[PDB]
Ligand binder design. Structure first.
Ligand SMILES: [Cu+2]
Ligand SMILES: [Cu+2]
Ligand SMILES: [Cu+2]
Ligand SMILES: [Cu+2]
Ligand SMILES: [Cu+2]
Ligand SMILES: [Cu+2]
Ligand SMILES: [Zn+2]
Ligand SMILES: [Zn+2]
Ligand SMILES: [Zn+2]
Ligand SMILES: [Zn+2]
Ligand SMILES: [Zn+2]
Ligand SMILES: [Zn+2]
Ligand SMILES: [Zn+2]
Ligand SMILES: [Zn+2]
Ligand SMILES: [Zn+2]
Lengths: 336, 336, 336
């Protein structure tokens, strides 16, 4: 429990919506778990009308990858800011204690890197996000956030202490975007990141997003990119929102056990239709599929989901169960 | 527990704010409970300035009627869409499992009907709402939603398992409306439902409602239409909001026991001043009146309540209790 | 427990962010606790650009002072409205039962005073606010609200019934302000309170605040006015928001035990990153500092905090703990 004397392990991160391989309950003692992330500023196409965002990311994606450790472990992150970027960046882990979540110890200009270590002494899903002095909201709404999941060493439990397991974990980052429009009513397109700043701050101040998207763009988690599962399988759905409130809902399903405030030492609530993720936090829900078909997983402000983008799909294979639901009479002429 | 072999019972629905007669705790075994609803598109006057809404409803009201069953029962709904309507409709029960809550099995064009059955295996208050492919938010904000209440077979309980009862139940549906204005600054009035569409979607995208009303219009639950009760009586207040968050509060009273996320297998919280109903959900509060007089029951964003409409009244008869509250000195000149 | 036969004690109130001296657990039996407050309408400078607010306050401050009693006690408030004010006022205690929280018994015109007594029979942090018939939202968003804290007679407890203590309590009132602008794009400045009314109601109806501030102005709880503490000290952070939702977060810290709905007979949640205060309520969090340095305490809609004002600082003295957090490698050139 002096970290300098514990065993170290290096973890290879994977892009959302997947989550790197990890153990739930573990017999291992505490470890220093080492991760590396490289910041990439890049222009991204965020809708099907050609709208672009002068975006800023951890590891090339929105959200950044999910990092998974166990309660008692130490997180050790090397943060790299290449010389091909234009702005300075840093990282604030909501799961850490002190120095503005680590931000004060990780201020890196383009061409620099830094390494931070902190004790992950609290279980739960926590946001991590960039927070450079003087430009915090701009870096966060441009894409710089992701989740740290700290699992209890004994794995997740229900309100009575019974063991809960998941077969697969998915991570969904929800981003309220503020794209400026010009006097012709079209969204603006900037040559550089610094040029989008002033216009973007004015839109931010109205508190009305132009778009609200899951994982970087409208329909990101649809079509070939839909989430997948099978009847009988239990999924863990991690949902982060670093700037604004959201209310997740699984259409045709439920939140079997949900930690909406995302902290695993608290008992979960069961049978939720819709849950609430406070801006500045990550929460987690378990669901075991009982019916096959296409589900929608969305923010249940329905204008925010269908008009502004905050909706994805989960394609589930398996056998239909008529005891749970059955069409008694299909659509047909009204008896006259 | 094969539904095809259980006894069937037909229930006659009643308009909000009342709730059809039903048992709380019951000794009956599971049943297939049959209900019928007819969709009615209609223009409604929603304020005291003559503003109209091209509205869409279940059974002629906003919200639609509350359907009440017990955990373990099956809900069997016949959904009718008359030929006098212009749009196609369907129904998504958040209390059901599979096929987009039943929406995929109930798509009815004008002149058609369908019958769906599902197992009500989770206790709580759940939203049901229309959700036609391509126009989901418009149908919901135009009035198509209501609540399904699934009671535990043993009735409601407190955190310690003690029995809780209500003498009367009221259902309140809260609707964020997006009425378009023309270039003269007045709200528009349309000859048909289809003509209001495009203008309405543009207002919806601003995320700013023009009006927010309880049960179909400003002041719906006031005057001759105020809710009523007596000192000593315990009321159940069901509150649904299918699209946007709300925060109910009883002025002069409290939420004695509240399930804000609306799911009865979870323990309730006590003594709440103000609770929170996530958009896309229904929640429930119990209160036993201890003082007579006129109470206000409202959304405690006070601009939303007093300026935009989200407020009602409860008139309570009985005896004033000076031990709970007493005027020591009435308003009078300040001692000089 | 007839209040007319209990001992009376008078309490001297202190300005926010401090809270008057009081006992947590007490051996005393119930008391009638007497307080006095004087309303002061005044113009206030609310930002660093000279913007003014035609404000309305309890006791000269935003928020008004926090009143602290114990469960079972009676609150007896004398409310004074001097003749130098222009409007009528009253008080609604969310902690009281009946007569619109006391508002119906305390309507005082300029030149009048009144005295109300009520039983504080429910533990928790509760909002109190002004609510004059016909102008409720305007008086509340102009500054008339504060908190009543009713402590359990045995002091605060955790979910298992273990005793929890605080060494110091701070009270933070968060105010969504709606300052009108004129046709030249500058904020308006009014000669009198009544002149600001009509313009202000039009801004309120957009539901978009111009500014969101802690304790009366942008940066109120910064610089010489930062909150203070030491490593090892446990602080109680009371947060009220009488009109609009907010989501408090301590940067570099956590909510060790939090009652977000603010009612102490309910078990608290632990390890929160960010909590939620519903508009129309007050909530409370405990935190024991483990690291020295400057923390930010803010609403984690980051545009609301950094662009609109809802952020303060806590300066903490003590010794840095490298086991909780350590810079392994400071910012330096990337290895080529
Ligand atoms: Cu950054
Ligand atoms: Cu943060
Ligand atoms: Cu419809
Ligand atoms: Cu829905
Ligand atoms: Cu007032
Ligand atoms: Cu109030
Ligand atoms: Zn080592
Ligand atoms: Zn580990
Ligand atoms: Zn499994
Ligand atoms: Zn049958
Ligand atoms: Zn039944
Ligand atoms: Zn009763
Ligand atoms: Zn006395
Ligand atoms: Zn006392
Ligand atoms: Zn202490």
């Amino acid at each position: 429990q002096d970290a300098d004397k514990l065993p170290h392990t290096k973890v290879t991160l994977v892009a959302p919506p997947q989550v790197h391989p990890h153990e739930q309950a573990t017999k291992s003692g505490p470890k220093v778990v080492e991760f590396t992330m490289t910041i990439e500023e890049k222009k991204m196409v965020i809708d099907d009308k050609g709208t672009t965002l002068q975006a800023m990311t951890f590891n090339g994606s929105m959200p950044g990858p999910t990092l998974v450790v166990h309660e008692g472990d130490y997180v050790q992150l090397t943060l790299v800011n290449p010389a091909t970027n234009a702005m300075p960046h840093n990282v604030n882990f909501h799961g850490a204690t002190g120095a503005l979540g680590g931000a004060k110890l990780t201020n890196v200009n383009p061409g620099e890197q830094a390494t931070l270590r902190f004790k992950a002494d609290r279980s739960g899903t926590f946001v991590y996000h960039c927070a450079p002095e003087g430009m915090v909201p701009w870096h966060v709404v441009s894409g710089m956030s992701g989740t740290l999941m700290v699992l209890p060493r004994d794995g997740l439990k229900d309100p009575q202490g019974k063991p809960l397991h998941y077969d697969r974990a998915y991570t969904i980052g929800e981003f309220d975007l503020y794209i400026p429009k010009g006097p012709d009513g079209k969204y603006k397109d900037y040559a550089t990141l610094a040029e989008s700043y002033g216009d973007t701050v004015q839109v931010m101040r109205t508190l009305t997003p132009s778009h609200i998207v899951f994982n970087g763009k409208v329909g990101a988690l649809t079509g070939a990119n839909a989430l997948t599962a099978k009847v009988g399988e239990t999924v863990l759905l991690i949902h982060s929102q670093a700037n604004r409130d959201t209310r997740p809902h699984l259409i045709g399903g439920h939140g079997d056990w949900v930690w909406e405030t995302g902290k695993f030492a608290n008992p979960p609530q069961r049978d939720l239709e819709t849950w609430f993720i406070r801006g500045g936090s990550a929460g987690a829900a378990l669901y075991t599929f009982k019916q096959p078909g296409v589900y929608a997983y969305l923010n249940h402000n329905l204008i925010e989901a269908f008009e502004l983008g905050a909706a994805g799909h989960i394609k589930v294979e398996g056998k239909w169960n008529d005891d749970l639901m059955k069409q008694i009479k299909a659509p047909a002429p009204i008896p006259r």
